[PDB]
């Protein structure tokens, strides 16, 4: 059959509204890992097929099938005979079927957490950016078109939106926010550390006792033409111990089982390793951006002092004390308005807020 | 069954808005290679069928089927007997089933990257073309029809849109853009090099040790009537080594397996080679266009100096110093407006911007 | 099952807007050949059934089925025995299964190319007919109904649309178009040559070594009652060589296989030959029309000089010098407006353009 | 399963707009023959079942099934033994499975051609009736309701629609139409001859060597209770020659096969013969109508001279010379307006055109 | 499975607009007989099952199944032995499977013809009732609600609708209609005779040689408890002659086949006989209504002379000569307006037409 779900993918992939730069790799990460996880445990609707001997009546084949899938499997390159005891034969032991498809779902969830941390944390800060942005937005969606306001366009932002934002600041500033920028940079630290932990989980996945995977080694093998049977690891043909019961208890034998899933798993561990290390390095530089921002803060004002330089007629109020009134809170939320509404609609907003800021400072 | 997906193909094939010339062969390339890849690994919902001997009970047939698919296969033209050892029989060894259907998906993704590079890079440059184009666009969609503005049509562009664009330039020009044209031509260099690398991946695909494919050789064979068995390569009937286990370990035999997929794969490697070399040569000339543009730049102004020659009443301001004010940034974004909105609506825009450009120069 | 796709057929069959006369046989050709191709390789969801002898266990039947389909088949009229060697038996050898269903898809694509050549070429010429036609169109869709403009109807075309068209000509005429008519007639030459090449591909299809098909011979046989077995070619019952492997290598035998597809293929090669030769002869006369047009050009003006003869009040400007101003470019685009908008709405447009043409000549 | 397609049947059955009287039996003919054809080759999703002897293993049953379907079948009434040689047994030979379901599709197409001839031919004539009719139509759809125009209703047709039609005549009359009526009557001759040829194809279908079908003979048999086995023709139980291969080559035997399709085919050849002869005789009288029209032409004016007799106030212009101005072209297009818009809305149009016709004559 | 088609049943069952009294039993008749016919030949997706003896291998069971269905079957009450020869055993011979399900479809079509006769015939008469009724209808749908016209309501019908109808009469009366009432009563004669012929076809169906069916006999048996086996006719268990072929030719035997369809067929021949005789007697009285109408015609005017008796203020014009002007044509179309629009909206129309009728008489 075929399964194509457009809508549910569009829910996370689209619906929640933000343009946040490359923080939307949480949005797409959840989709990739969620779809891969839900696809693998779907078993491509036979995971494993086996050689079980002549006289089994085919209700046992459908048994030794699972009993090989559930109980572990192992591998030996072939011609070593079987070795002996339980050890040298079981030395290389490949069962990651138990982990991978579920631990991916867990991965995806742990990529979704940081957004939740940011929503709950901004609701803790007291000043909601979602409402403000969606407001000044549609203010800019209405009268951008209307020709009645252009020569007035500057004075239009003065009354209606700028009093809304500048009014929200008065309420928030009395409740648990001068700090909301700090809360944001903690959110992005959590983003980075989360990414690296996920990557490390990919590495330590499979089993650390038998190697570990990271891409340029595997591609540095395949592209040398080492396949599997001559590379000594990661096989597609696995022997399977097997146990009946009689008054002689164990009665174990070895039945080799061709193994399909191992053709997918290491075709997508070459991709998904590159893509997770990419999400890691693009998420970790975004963090140092904001520690730099939070630290220097004298060059955090370059964008605002830049917008105030266009400033038709440049009326009166001085520069510094405007930052004295706006400094802790608004200096951030402006860096948010520029990121969503665009650039030019923000400059009008921050040049209007300079005119009406008196009573507060 | 039948699978027909119109919508998801229309998402990439349509939804993101641009007319960029023959840069939309990334758009269609992703569709061709993505659909081919997703179709091949669908196995036309039997990949390979085999001759396995008389006494197997049909749970082994369904085994030696995979065990032949997963483990490699090879070919010998027939009547050579089997030769001997492991080598002369395995000399020509055909397994590209492992690579092709997945490496196509990887291809498609690597065709989608350059668009991403251009979006992220223009967001780095500071001046967003998407917003501007979509703005002056619907400005031209509203009052193109309205009869109240025609004798005023020139003066209409003066106030409303031209102040928007010409205002965006003031903001961008202070932040990391005189260069956005250079960023664009780097994007197109990446486009070309990406295309040629993809083509080279097609060539080196299959296995370089046993020939390599490029079209006029294969068609230069088929159209001479060499099929396969007499051309010595690329078969549809492949022998398959096979291994049981007993106290005598290997016990290998040879069971020839009729092989269906090889009827598709080299029907679409004749097409897809031509089509990739075409995308290559149409993408590589588009690049030299922009290096020429970026270099000479005295003949990059021919279109603007051309629009200013229609110029009703040709009021006052001289020619050169207009380019002195507009030169680095706007000279590009105009070449973008002409490409999307059409030609005649752009000439009005660039003849209006000449009138209101004073304060900035 | 049943597959009925209305929408995707309506996309090519309808969506792209033009009335171009019998150039829409590219539009319908792509549909016929695409649907036939996609239907044939669907195998009418058994291509071939065979007689394979008594003791095969039905996993071999499902093998010799393909091994007969993939490896070639041949035919002998029956009672000749088998002849001998490999030659006299294989003299008539029927395998076109490999070619036909795919080479049809290739056909269809090569019918779609010329439209692409025309779009890209008109975008090279500098003056876009699509925008202009869709503009003066909906200008004629709005105020055709409105009763306020009829006595003014002539003066209505004067201001709004005619300045748009006549303004586009000023821009184009400075960039790489006096020639757009020539580009068009090259497009139609490509149309004709493309058609004849496709037809010749039908002929040389099957195999030229064993006859070739063209309709009045086949119908000139069937309607004489020659079927197949007595006509010596084109059978529905084909013998199939077959090869096992043992220490005696070849072990070939002959197993006759009833062959279904051959009932479809030559029911639609009687139709599709007629229909391609029709598309050829209707496409090739359309070409000589435009070479005649491009050559004489004194009788290319008959339609315009005809429209200017209705001409209420026939004000002032002389005849010839109007053509001197309009000659190279507009004389074409008018022959385009007449073809899409209809006839009477074009006459108003070309009688209005005579009034406002002064400044340009 | 069940297949019900409403929309595609509604496309031809409805969408193209015309009321043309009983020329819409092309419209419905295409539907009947197309649906019958597509239903028969669907095989009622077993065409033929057979008696094949005891020891065949059921992969041969599924062979001799086709090999009987593809290779011909014959019939003998039973108890004649088998006769002998190849002739007396094969005398009556029933295979129309090869022809019927496809030749119906061909029929349907050849019913659709004449409409195409009429569209292309009217586009050759220079004056498009589709646009005009759809125009004066919605002119009559708008202000039929509006109460502001009734006492003015006559004067309403004077300005807006009548100048449109009467203006189109000026353009057409200069290009290849005084004749469009003649083109129409050639179209209807083609209609009639096409119908009779189709009917004759039904007759000569099956095989002329063994009888031929026309209804009152078959019903004149069935309703006498002659079924098949006693009527000597048209059986439901057919013997089937069959050929193996051994060192004795032919080895033919006779295996009688119950035959289902023959229960449908002559249930719908009783219907479809009546219905085609009806379409023939209703289409052939429609033709003599228009040859009469084109010939006498003094009584072709009875409808117009009839409309001019209601004529409130009957102002001035004489009768004959109005026909002198309108005679060749408009006299037809009026007989078209009466057929689509109805009758009363046409009389207003032709009584208005008498008032404004001066300048043209 | 399940098949439920609402829309196609709603097309005939609803879409064509008329209230014609009990002439809509053609509308519902077509649905009943069409659905029954299409359901029966669907075989309730096994028509007949049979006892065929022990040693048949189940590819013969699936043969003797059809060979019993196609070739006839017969019946004997049981214990008579088999009798002898071919006659006494085959005396009662039940095969109506061949006829019934198709002859029902033919029935339905022959119920649909009379509507077609009426549409074509009214289009022959020259005055189209469909347009008029649908016009004065929506005239009554608009201003019935509007409160501005009530005291004016009488004068409202005077200008707008009544001039439309009374104007159509002037055109029609000059072309082939004083007679349209006569055409209508011929249509209803055809309706009645058609109904009785259909009923007689039900009777003579099955086979007249073995009884015939009409309801009160069958129910007069079942409700006496005569079932089948003791009533001597109409069985559910039928013996089936059967023929192999050997050098002894016939080799016929008798294999009794349980027969399911016979449980449906005479459950719905009890219903459908009553329902057809009802449609007959309700359709035949509707006919004598109109012969009475057409004949006396002095009491055909009772409804109009009745409406003119309400007549506010009863202005001037006498009674009889109004009928002299309206007599042949309008006297009918009024009896049509009363049947569709209702009664009270018609009285206003016929009291308005009395006021404005002067010029015509």
UniProtKB/Swiss-Prot annotation, chains A, B, C, D, E:
Localization, UniProt: Cell membrane; Cell junction, Gap junction
Database matches in Pfam families: Innexin
Organism field: Caenorhabditis elegans
Name of the protein in question: Innexin-6
GO-annotated biological processes: monoatomic ion transmembrane transport
PROSITE patterns with a match to the protein in the record: PANNEXIN
Purpose: Structural component of the gap junctions.
Taxonomic path: Eukaryota, Metazoa, Ecdysozoa, Nematoda, Chromadorea
GO CC, alphabetical: gap junction; plasma membrane
The entry's keywords: Cell junction, Cell membrane, Gap junction, Ion channel, Ion transport, Membrane, Transmembrane, Transmembrane helix, Transport
Protein's UniProt keywords contain Transmembrane: yes
Record field: transmembrane: 30-48, 103-123, 182-202, 268-288
Family that this chain belongs to: Belongs to the pannexin family.
Primary location group: membrane
InterPro entries per record: Innexin
GO MF terms held by the record: gap junction channel activity; gap junction hemi-channel activity
Membrane topology: Multi-pass membrane protein
